């Protein structure tokens, strides 16, 4: 018969494990680089006992 147009078999739709297992509301990391504004040094504590 007449020519039929090709039907592109595009599927993709692999989705993504976007939903965490339960909620996986846990990505724990700690401050490491001694914060910023590293502040002063020993600030001469010394002792005050009356020698």
């Amino acid at each position: 018969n007449k020519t039929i147009s090709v039907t592109l078999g595009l599927r993709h739709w692999k989705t993504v494990s976007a939903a965490p297992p339960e909620k996986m509301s846990k990505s724990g990391v700690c401050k490491i680089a001694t914060n910023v504004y590293n502040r002063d040094g020993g600030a001469n504590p010394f002792l005050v006992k009356y020698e």
Binding site: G9, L10, R11, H12, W13, K14, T15, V16, S17
Partner: protein, 51 residues
Amino acid sequence: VTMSPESVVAAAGGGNNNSGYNEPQRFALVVIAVNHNVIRIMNGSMGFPIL
């Protein structure tokens, strides 16, 4: 689609009181289609083999 004489006369207004077509009438054609599809579920996720 072929229209109807009742519609072509109701499109123009001039109908008497409580006739419904006392004012010009407008019509809109709508078409709805129902099809088939396949859903695939694997490794805790869903996908569309054909989309």
